[PDB]
């Protein structure tokens, strides 16, 4: 038997005392039968009038079958049960798995009832099966094992299974076992016969504790279509994605398409969705039809072709280095691929996360490095050596001059156009011979010139970007610009090369054409 | 699993235990953690827990100073914040104002001293922690403490007595030495020449071994506050004057006696930036007075035991950093500078960690409390690399921020 896990109710609460719904004789007859079965099996045992707690039960028929099932409504008891460590949503990613000669999945089979329930807690699982004639039986029961559908069941069952498997695991340190729901995955590099035997051995080890497992004649064989994936002994991939051939596309359709499209990203490089996302602008209803533009059409056609190609990922080989390579697919878009062996990945991906309203490729590429770093540590436990399209000098220039602290692991420059660069750099010292503009929506120069323009609907801070812009447009190749807007100063000082604000983008364009620019700040009153 | 008497500890009223997430660990760290945790399990220090304990506290592996040995570090920060305060009356522990004046102070990690005292059976669940697994391939090894844990605030309090008894002899045999405890750390100050100092340090060591109790060497005396400085130059241009004004216009919020009048008058007219402007007599004397005013920290800054200690750090470049410790805005208790040390390796993160640590030691030595840092770095980055260079046994509360371009220009 297994060691009982002590359960407690949430502090300051009493057990469930909820009424049982009136039942149909037909069903009562079914319940009495099922409950007796469970009592003979010791799963449950009748109680005395001592117990005031109760939980509703009802009979259900099996889907597309003709027979009775017993369902207990543990909602209430669950609200009152303490929290457990429970199952974290942390699941293994296919690219983290290694190659195996043979893998099998043993379907545990309701081991919930195979595991005992803390005696002290047992009373809280009380339920009642009403009598057929008014004043009569009305059998009262309580659980002796883990109730199907109870709060602690999934957690306690998993903990129990782990203990039960500790030994078998120490005995065979060449066999990986992974638990998931009512499934037990066993993988191994044993030649087929040896494996097949070891599996039968594991089954017996479960049977000793009551975990009735399935025979090799009805077990699930690879691939393992698990969570949108298709698991194989040596390779992996995602469940085949089929793109619709619609004439009319609803916003809902377009939205689902982008979702399926994004999913593919992790393995299919080249998947693009920008054009498709644009169809969502100004949409008034999920049922609204948006015709497709020539660019969206071209993008859909391209992804369709990309998907007609059954690419697959490869498992991790602990003996070889991890290599991450990053590229610029578009403005703001970066594509990466992690491989151990020359140009054939374990996983791929995209990075479009724009942090802040303005940025530059150098800053953005850096942030992609950090995402991959976190992701690699999570999946493979170590960071990959990166191959980036930026030269050392370029990175060091930006780095040492930026106010924030940054650090890139270990990388190598890869001359693969486009090479990321800084399109412009502000002067560290005011330009001699250059004209000086004193902005405020209007500027005045040392040379006498001046323009006062009219701005409508402008925000306080945007008016400040405008003046700078103005000075920028009317000046020569070399300019000195004095401003009082610490805001505008901040932005332009950041050396952005892309922004959400078109005004900033224009200023940026102006900045690129100049030979020399010095921006200075001063309080103005 | 426990001996002697266990002192009952409780979380603050109504407070529940911590359920903090574990930041992803590197395979090497995990391995180090598994090796270390198994020995602690055998020694009965910790025990595997079941799914009926929902709590969690983050753990990490750091590297001991000049030693190929890892040290499990447990981020008990949240738990400590939820742990009851500890008594009143005659608490022989406060803080030696004298410790900061000493010539040499050594730090000793007397953390293992806790491992000899059991933790109240009931509080044990709250100290829960989890060794993570590569790619979630396995549930994760869960443990809790049976003994006073390192890094928890309750530990020094509960061991306080056992500690004083042990130190009373050395304390009365060498009163020319100042010893102050902070968490797992022990501060040993003295004015003896470096030679006699290290000797005495070593002697305290074996004296601790004597009772089962098994690196860093400061010089608090030489700590000096960094004042606000103004560019002194041969000839001044419009630009120089413009900057001098912005700076002085800021420092005035601190020292109000700073005037800019004359200097501003030199900035009349849309002249060219590069145009050199000689300073009128009345301006030269204004700048000069401004200089004298900045020669010293602002009068009236007092440490308040009841307020948070905040520390801000700024990237100045080429391995240089500037920090300030204060409680009320602009009212600094201290300001300083930091330049890359220990290795032709240094990158932004390693330096920041060294700096944070450096500033933290000082606060403990000075006020006997760690500060709340405002770090100039992206969270994800910090969380990924901080552990790789950390060596302290305590972990201060930190937050991340976006340093203003102007503040930098006003320091160093
Ligand atoms: C569905 C999940 C999470 C399976 C995890 N699972 C089964 C599996 C399946 C294949 Cl085809 C190759 C695998 N390689 C490895 S490692 N595993 C694995 C780990 C365990 C044994
Ligand atoms: Mg102006």
- Token pair, residue A179, equals 């638990």
Q: Which residues pair with A183 in a beta bridge?
A: A180
- Structure's resolution in angstroms: 2.6
CATH class name, domain B1-92+115-155: alpha beta
- Which residues contact residue B14 at a Cβ distance below 8 angstroms, ignoring those fewer than 6 apart? none
- CB atoms inside a 10 Å sphere around CB A327: 20
- With tokens 């005395």, the residue in question is A48
- CB atoms inside a 10 Å sphere around CB B57: 26
- Token pair, residue A405, equals 């602290």
How would CATH label the architecture of A317-423? Answer: 2-Layer Sandwich (3.30)
The closest of A433, A229, A195 to A313, measured between CA atoms, is A229
SS3 call for B286? helix
Write the CA distances from A233 to A102, A173, A266, A339, B189, integer angstroms. Answer: 6, 18, 19, 18, 63
d(C-alpha A174, C-alpha A195), whole Å: 11
d(C-alpha A350, C-alpha A272), whole Å: 9
Chain B CB contacts of A363 under 8 Å are none
Strand residues in B241-306 grouped as ranges (E): none
Question: Where along chain A do its domains lie?
Answer: 1-87+113-153, 88-112+154-222, 223-316, 317-423, 424-523
Pairing mode of beta strands A139-143, A127-129: antiparallel
d(C-alpha A232, C-alpha A244), whole Å: 27
A250 near B CB under 8 A: no
Q: Which residues pair with A344 in a beta bridge?
A: A341
What CATH number was assigned to the domain covering residues B304-410?
A: 3.30.70.270
The domain defined by B93-114+156-222 folds into Alpha-Beta Plaits (3.30.70)
What CATH number was assigned to the domain covering residues A223-316?
A: 3.30.70.270
d(C-alpha A506, C-alpha B278), whole Å: 39
Q: Which ligand sits closest to the CA of A521?
A: 2
B246 near A CB under 8 A: yes
> Are A150 and A77 a contacting pair, CB within 8 Å?
yes
How many residues belong to chain B? 412
Pairing mode of beta strands A235-236, B320-328: unpaired
Write the CA distances from B241 to A417, B267, B283, B347, integer angstroms. Answer: 45, 7, 11, 35
d(C-alpha B235, C-alpha B231), whole Å: 11
The closest of B88, B114, B113, B81 to B12, measured between CA atoms, is B81
Nearest to B134 among A96, A179, A401 (CB): A96
The CATH superfamily holding the domain B223-303 is Reverse transcriptase/Diguanylate cyclase domain (3.30.70.270)
A489 near B CB under 8 A: yes
B400 near A CB under 8 A: no
- Token pair, residue B126, equals 């709250």
Experimental method of this PDB entry: X-ray
Q: Which residues pair with B84 in a beta bridge?
A: none
Question: Where along chain B do its domains lie?
Answer: 1-92+115-155, 93-114+156-222, 223-303, 304-410
The domain defined by A424-523 folds into Nucleotidyltransferase; domain 5 (3.30.420)
> Are B273 and B317 a contacting pair, CB within 8 Å?
no
Give residues 186 to 245 of B whose Cβ lies within 8 Å of A. Answer: 237, 239, 242-243, 245
Distance between Cα A174 and ligand 1 center (Å)? 13
> Are B152 and B75 a contacting pair, CB within 8 Å?
no
Q: Fold identical between B223-303 and B304-410?
A: yes
Q: Which residues pair with A71 in a beta bridge?
A: A58
Nearest CA to ligand 1 atom 15: A97
Q: Measured in whole angstroms, how far is the alpha carbon of residue A314 from the centre of its chain? A: 20
SS3 call for B47? strand
DSSP string, B378-390: -HHHHHHHHHHH-
Pick the residue of B47, B52, B121, B323 with the most A CBs within 10 A to test the interface with A by mutation.
B52
d(C-alpha A190, C-alpha A174), whole Å: 9
Q: Fold identical between A317-423 and A424-523?
A: no
d(C-alpha B19, C-alpha B273), whole Å: 58
The closest of A400, A423, A421, A424 to A517, measured between CA atoms, is A424
CATH class name, domain A88-112+154-222: alpha beta
Domain A1-87+113-153 has CATH 2.70.98.60: no
| Contacts by B173-180, CB closer than 8 A, 24 or more apart | B174/B200, B177/B204, B178/B96, B178/B98, B178/B99, B178/B102, B178/B105, B179/B204, B180/B95, B180/B96, B180/B99, B180/B365, B180/B368
């Amino acid at each position: 038997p297994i060691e009982t896990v002590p359960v407690k109710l949430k502090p300051g609460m009493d057990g469930p005392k909820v009424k049982q719904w009136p039942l149909t004789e037909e069903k009562i007859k079914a319940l009495v039968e099922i409950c007796t079965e469970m009592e003979k099996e010791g799963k449950i045992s009748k109680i005395g009038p001592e117990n005031p707690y109760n939980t509703p039960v009802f009979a259900i028929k099996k889907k597309d079958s003709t027979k009775w099932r017993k369902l207990v409504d543990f909602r209430e008891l669950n609200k009152r049960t303490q929290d457990f460590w429970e199952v974290q949503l942390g699941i293994p990613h296919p690219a983290g798995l290694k190659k195996k000669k043979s893998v099998t999945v043993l379907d545990v089979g309701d081991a919930y009832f195979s595991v005992p329930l803390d005696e002290d807690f047992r009373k809280y699982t009380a339920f009642t099966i009403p009598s057929i004639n008014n004043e009569t039986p009305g059998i009262r029961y309580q659980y002796n094992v883990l109730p199907q559908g109870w709060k602690g069941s999934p957690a306690i069952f998993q903990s129990s299974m782990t203990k039960i498997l500790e030994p078998f695991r120490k005995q065979n340190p060449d066999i990986v076992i992974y638990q998931y729901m009512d499934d037990l995955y066993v993988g191994s590099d044993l030649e087929i016969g040896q494996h097949r035997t070891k599996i039968e051995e594991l089954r017996q080890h479960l049977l000793r504790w009551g975990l009735t497992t399935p025979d090799k004649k009805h077990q699930k064989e690879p691939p393992f279509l698990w969570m949108g994936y298709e698991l194989h002994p040596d390779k992996w991939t995602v469940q085949p994605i089929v793109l619709p051939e619609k004439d009319s596309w609803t916003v809902n359709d377009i939205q689902k398409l982008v979702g399926k499209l994004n999913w593919a990203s992790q393995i299919y490089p080249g998947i693009k969705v920008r054009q498709l996302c644009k169809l969502l602008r100004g949409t008034k209803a999920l049922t609204e039809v948006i015709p497709l533009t020539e660019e969206a059409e071209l993008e859909l056609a391209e992804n369709r072709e990309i998907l007609k190609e059954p690419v697959h990922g490869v498992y991790y080989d602990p003996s070889k280095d991890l290599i991450a390579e990053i590229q610029k697919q578009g403005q703001g878009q970066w594509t990466y691929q992690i491989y151990q062996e020359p140009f054939k990945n374990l996983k791929t991906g995209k990075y479009a996360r724009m942090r802040g309203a303005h940025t530059n490729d150098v800053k953005q590429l850096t942030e992609a490095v950090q995402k991959i770093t976190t992701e690699s540590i999570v999946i493979w436990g170590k960071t990959p050596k990166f191959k980036l399209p930026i030269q050392k000098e370029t990175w060091e220039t930006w780095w040492t001059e930026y106010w924030q602290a940054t650090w890139i692991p270990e990388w190598e420059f890869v001359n693969t156009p486009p090479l990321v660069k800084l399109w412009y750099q502000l002067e560290k010292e005011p330009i001699v011979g250059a004209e000086t503009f004193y902005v405020d929506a209007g500027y005045v120069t040392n040379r006498g010139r001046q323009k006062v323009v009219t701005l409508t609907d402008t925000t306080n801070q945007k008016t400040e970007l405008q003046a700078i812009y103005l000075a920028l447009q009317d000046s020569g190749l070399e300019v000195n610009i004095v401003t009082d807007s610490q805001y505008a100063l901040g932005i332009i000082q950041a050396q952005p090369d892309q922004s959400e604000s078109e005004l900033v983008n224009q200023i940026i364009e102006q900045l690129i054409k100049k030979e020399k620019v010095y921006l200075a700040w001063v309080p103005a009153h | 699993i426990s001996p002697i008497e266990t002192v009952p500890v409780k979380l603050k009223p109504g407070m529940d235990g911590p359920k903090v997430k574990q930041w992803p660990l590197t395979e090497e760290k995990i391995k180090a953690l598994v090796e270390i945790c198994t020995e602690m399990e055998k020694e009965g220090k910790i025990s595997k827990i079941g799914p009926e304990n929902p709590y969690n506290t983050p753990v990490f592996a750091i590297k001991k100073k000049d030693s190929t040995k890892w040290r499990k570090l447990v981020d008990f920060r949240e738990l400590n914040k939820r742990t009851q305060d500890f008594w009143e009356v005659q608490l022989g522990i406060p803080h030696p104002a004298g410790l900061k004046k000493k010539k040499s102070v050594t730090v000793l990690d007397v953390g293992d001293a806790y491992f000899s005292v059991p933790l109240d059976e009931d509080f044990r669940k709250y100290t829960a922690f989890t060794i993570p697994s590569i790619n979630n391939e396995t549930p994760g090894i869960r443990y809790q403490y049976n003994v006073l844990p390192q890094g928890w605030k309750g530990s020094p309090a509960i061991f306080q007595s056992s500690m004083t008894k042990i130190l009373e002899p050395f304390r009365k045999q060498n009163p020319d030495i100042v010893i102050y405890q902070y968490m797992d750390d022990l501060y040993v100050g003295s004015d003896l020449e470096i030679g006699q100092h290290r000797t005495k340090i070593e002697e305290l060591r074996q004296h601790l071994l004597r009772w089962g109790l098994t690196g860093y060497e400061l010089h608090p005396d030489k700590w000096t506050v960094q004042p606000i400085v103004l560019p002194e130059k041969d000839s001044w241009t419009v630009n120089d004057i413009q900057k001098l004004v912005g700076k002085l216009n800021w420092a005035s919020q601190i020292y109000p006696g700073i005037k800019v009048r004359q200097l501003c008058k030199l900035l009349r007219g849309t002249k060219a930036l590069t145009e050199v402007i000689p300073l009128t007599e009345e301006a030269e004397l204004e700048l000069a007075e401004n200089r004298e005013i900045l020669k010293e920290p602002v009068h009236g800054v007092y440490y308040d035991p009841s307020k948070d200690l905040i520390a801000e750090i700024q990237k100045q470049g080429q391995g240089q950093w500037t920090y300030q410790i204060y409680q009320e805005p602009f009212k600094n208790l201290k300001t300083g500078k930091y330049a890359r040390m220990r290795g032709a390796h240094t990158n932004d993160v390693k330096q920041l960690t060294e700096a944070v640590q450096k500033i933290t030691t000082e606060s403990i030595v000075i006020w006997g409390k760690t500060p709340k840092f405002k770090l100039p770095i992206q969270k994800e980055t910090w969380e990924t690399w901080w552990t790789e260079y950390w060596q302290a046994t305590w972990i201060p509360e930190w937050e991340f921020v976006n340093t203003p371009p102007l503040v930098k220009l006003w320091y160093q």
